[PDB]
């Protein structure tokens, strides 16, 4: 299941993934809370994202 970013997000920690609205993301892990570990299919980068900034596709 891929997700699409609904907003831009600028990294706020060294472990975050920055992304732009419309980027497509794969969830690597969502077991730890509302911050999900994701991989950008667009940019190739990996990191945590706020789960309320994305929607399923």
């Amino acid at each position: 299941m891929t997700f699409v970013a609904l907003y831009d997000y600028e990294a706020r920690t060294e472990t975050d993934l920055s992304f732009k609205k419309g980027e497509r993301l794969q969830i690597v892990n969502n077991t730890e809370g509302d911050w999900w570990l994701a991989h950008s299919l667009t940019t190739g980068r990996t990191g945590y994202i706020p789960s309320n900034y994305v929607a399923p596709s």
Binding site: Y7, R12, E32, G33, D34, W35, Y48, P50, S51, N52, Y53
Partner: peptide, 10 residues
Amino acid sequence: APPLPPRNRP
């Protein structure tokens, strides 16, 4: 934009 969630707890 929505408020950010609290950071994950262990």
